[PDB]
C-alpha cells in the first residue's frame, strides 16, 4: 500500500506556562516513531520498532541537529513576526517528508505555516517556493537565492527521504504492513415519523484507510450521505461509519483490496 | 557512512588538464565538497553537488553521478598555483563530513 | 573570517593548553579538526549551535566550551605526544543543511615533546 514519512515541527513564541517553545514529531504512515522538543531537549523514540533498532548514536546525533533546528525556528519565527508587525505569542509550523505510493511512484512535500495558515510551499520540481502573502515573498526570494540548498532539498526528498521510509517500513512491519479487515454492520431505524436512518458501521480495521458508500439498486450513489471520522478505537484499530434516509439500499466498503456488501 | 577514497597524488603538466577522482561508499548521501588547501594554507571551499551533473565555476568544474557513486573535480589549462592538494568529503544521512585523505596535484612546469 | 589562536606552540607532556577560535560571520555551528598526515580530517568536537556541544570522533584527551556564539575553544586538559598535529577550527551558517560549506581558521601548529 500507500506509506508515508513526515516530520512536524511547531515553534511558539513566548508561550504559556506549560507550552514547549519548539516541538518536533516525526511520523511514518499514522504512528508517531520520533519526539524531541525544548524542555527535555532529546529526541526519544516513541514506537518500539523504532527503539530497538536504533543504535543510541541515532539519538544522540539527532538529538543535536534538534537543538540546532529548534534555534533556527525561533529566530525564522522572530523574523516573520517583525514582517508581520505583530507582537504576542504566534506559531509556526514546518512539515516535510515523502510517500511511497503502492504503484511505485513517489511525492516529496516541505512545506511551512504561520498561526496555522499556509506560509509557504516547497515545489521541488521547479526548485521554487510558493508564497501566499508579501511576507512569505520576502522570504521566498532570500530562499530561492541559494541554488544549492534548493537542489539538496530536492534531493532528500526524493532519495534520503524515501530510504529512510523503506528503512522504517521495515523496522516496523509486523505493525506497518499488517491488515486487519472491518467489522461491518447495518443499522436500520424510524427516525422523526416518516423518515428511516440506515447506518452502516465499521470498527476494528486496521490500516485506518476505508472505503464506505451507499448505493441504490446496485448501480446509482444515494445522493446525501452522512460521513463519520475514521476514529482511533484506542487498541491500534479504527472505527467510522456512513449514513443515509421504495426500492433497494446497499452498504459498500472496501477495505485493503476486499469488497463487502451488505445489502437491506 | 563509511568511506572516501581519492589518489593520494596526481602529477600533470602545465596548461594541460586533471581530473581527479572522489569515489563513496556512504550510509546515506546528502552532498559531495571539493575544497582546495595550499601547503600550510587552511582549505577553503571549492564546489558542491548533490544532483547528477557538471558545475563549472571558472577553470574548475566539479561533477556527479549519484548512481556511481563518484564524483570528480576538472582543471583546465593547469598553472603552477593550482598545485595544492585537494579534499573530497561527502555529507552523509545524518549530515556528518566524511573526508578523503586528500590529492596532492603537482604541476610539471 | 575565523579567527584562531596560536598559530605555533610547543608543549611539555602533561602541560594544559587552550586553542581559542573567534567566528564573527554569525554562524550557528563550530567544529574542531586535527589533520595528520595520510588521513582525512578528523573531527574532535562540534557545537550545532549555542549551548550545545558534542563529541565528534576523537574527542580523548580534549573538551570544549562554546563559550558564546562566537567563540568555540578547545582544550588540552593533559597534553601528549600524540596530540603533536596541526589544529583547524571551522564554523557553518548551520548544520543539518546539505549545501552549507566550512569556513576554516589558519590553523594551530601543536608540538607535544617528552
Known amino acids: 500500500r500507500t506509506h508515508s514519512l513526515r516530520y512536524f515541527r511547531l515553534g511558539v513564541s513566548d508561550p504559556i506556562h506549560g507550552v514547549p517553545e519548539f516541538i518536533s514529531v516525526g511520523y511514518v504512515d499514522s504512528h508517531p516513531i520520533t519526539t524531541y522538543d525544548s524542555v527535555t531537549r532529546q529526541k526519544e523514540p516513541r514506537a518500539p520498532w523504532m527503539a530497538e533498532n536504533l543504535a543510541p548514536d541515532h539519538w544522540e546525533r539527532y538529538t543535536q541537529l534538534l537543538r540546532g533546528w529548534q534555534q533556527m525556528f525561533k529566530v525564522e519565527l522572530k523574523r516573520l513576526q517583525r514582517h508581520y508587525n505583530h507582537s504576542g505569542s504566534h506559531t509556526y509550523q514546518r512539515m516535510i517528508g515523502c510517500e511511497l505510493l503502492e504503484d511505485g511512484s513517489t511525492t516529496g512535500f516541505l512545506q511551512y505555516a504561520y498561526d496555522g495558515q499556509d506560509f509557504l510551499i516547497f515545489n521541488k520540481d521547479t526548485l521554487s517556493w510558493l508564497a501566499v502573502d508579501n511576507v512569505a515573498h520576502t522570504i521566498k526570494q532570500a530562499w530561492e537565492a541559494n541554488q544549492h540548498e534548493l537542489l539538496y532539498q530536492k534531493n532528500w526528498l526524493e532519495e534520503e527521504c524515501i530510504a529512510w521510509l523503506k528503512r522504517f517500513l521495515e523496522y516496523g512491519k509486523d505493525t506497518l504492513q499488517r491488515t486487519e479487515p472491518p467489522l461491518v454492520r447495518v443499522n436500520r431505524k424510524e427516525t422523526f415519523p416518516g423518515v428511516t436512518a440506515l447506518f452502516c458501521k465499521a470498527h476494528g480495521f486496521y490500516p485506518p484507510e476505508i472505503y464506505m458508500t451507499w448505493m441504490k439498486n446496485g448501480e446509482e450513489i444515494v445522493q446525501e450521505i452522512d460521513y463519520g471520522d475514521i476514529l482511533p478505537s484506542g487498541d491500534g484499530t479504527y472505527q467510522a461509519w456512513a449514513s443515509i434516509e421504495s426500492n433497494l439500499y446497499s452498504c459498500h466498503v472496501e477495505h485493503s483490496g476486499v469488497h463487502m456488501v451488505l445489502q437491506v | 557512512g563509511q568511506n572516501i577514497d581519492q589518489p593520494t597524488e596526481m602529477t600533470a603538466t602545465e596548461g594541460a588538464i586533471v581530473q581527479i577522482n572522489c569515489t563513496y561508499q556512504?550510509?546515506?548521501?546528502?552532498?559531495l565538497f571539493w575544497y582546495q588547501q595550499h601547503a600550510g594554507e587552511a582549505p577553503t571551499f571549492l564546489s558542491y553537488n548533490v544532483l547528477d551533473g557538471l558545475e563549472e565555476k571558472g577553470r574548475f568544474s566539479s561533477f556527479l553521478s549519484r548512481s556511481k557513486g563518484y564524483s570528480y573535480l576538472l582543471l583546465k589549462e593547469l598553472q603552477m598555483k593550482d598545485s595544492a592538494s585537494y579534499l573530497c568529503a561527502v555529507k552523509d544521512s545524518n549530515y556528518q563530513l566524511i573526508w578523503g585523505a586528500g590529492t596532492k596535484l603537482i604541476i610539471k612546469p | 573570517g575565523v579567527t584562531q589562536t596560536p598559530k605555533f606552540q610547543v608543549l611539555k607532556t602533561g602541560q594544559s593548553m587552550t586553542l581559542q577560535c573567534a567566528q564573527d560571520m554569525n554562524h550557528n555551528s563550530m567544529y574542531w579538526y586535527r589533520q595528520d598526515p595520510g588521513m582525512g580530517l578528523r573531527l574532535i568536537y562540534y557545537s550545532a549551535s549555542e549551548g550545545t556541544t558534542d563529541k565528534g570522533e576523537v574527542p580523548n584527551g580534549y573538551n570544549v566550551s562554546r563559550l558564546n556564539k562566537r567563540e568555540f575553544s578547545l582544550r588540552l586538559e593533559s597534553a601528549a605526544p600524540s596530540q603533536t598535529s596541526v589544529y583547524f577550527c571551522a564554523s557553518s551558517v548551520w548544520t543539518g543543511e546539505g549545501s552549507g560549506e566550512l569556513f576554516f581558521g589558519e590553523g594551530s601548529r601543536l608540538t607535544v615533546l617528552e
Open positions: 556512504t550510509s546515506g548521501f546528502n552532498g
